[PDB]
Amino acid sequence: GIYQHFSIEDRPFLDKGMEWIKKVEDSYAPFLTPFINPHQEKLLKILAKTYGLACSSSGEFVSSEYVRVLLYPDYFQPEFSDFEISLQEIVYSNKFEYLTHAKILGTVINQLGIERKLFGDILVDEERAQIMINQQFLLLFQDGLKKIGRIPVSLEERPFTEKID
Secondary structure, eight states, rough: OOOOOGGGGGGGHHHHHHHHHHHHHHSSOEOOOBBOHHHHHHHHHHHHHHHHEEEEEEEESOOOSOEEEEEEEETTOOGGGGGGGGEEEEEOOOOOHHHHHHHHHSSSSOOOOOOGGGEEEEOSSSSSOOEEEEEHHHHHHHHHHOOOOOOEEEEOOOOOGOOOO
16 A cells, blocks of 8 residues: 655654564564554554554554554454553542653652653543553552652552543
8 A cells, every 4th residue: 555655753663663573574473562652653554564464553442642562473363461551540649640650750759760661641631540551560560659749659450441531
């Protein structure tokens, strides 16, 4: 098919995307990406088609801005669990998306020099708050994210059914 022209700005990501595609070629097994933004998702979908590897985005299962993508041979198979995403309720508010985000990227208070690529959306409009995380890092979040600012918090698993706007 015909897709939108890439830009110079896209090259660093596309370079990574080509590495991921090669992993799948080498292994004839699925490769799961870190969290990426919607523009990056669109770029990887184009590359995958070009090579033509099958591609599924976690955004096609749970609507979100940040997504993880699975690249895979045709025999596979994908279920939502293959994206290795956990929803965590931040029990006792933030209140802010900004304040939660800040605490996550570093900190210390309470710990957490956590890279953007290890988590996706932080969700709030309100007083309840949640974060979508790479479940490989569940302990890092559950044991590390114990206060934001001044206010103590506790992270608990919730179904994506229970997922905030």
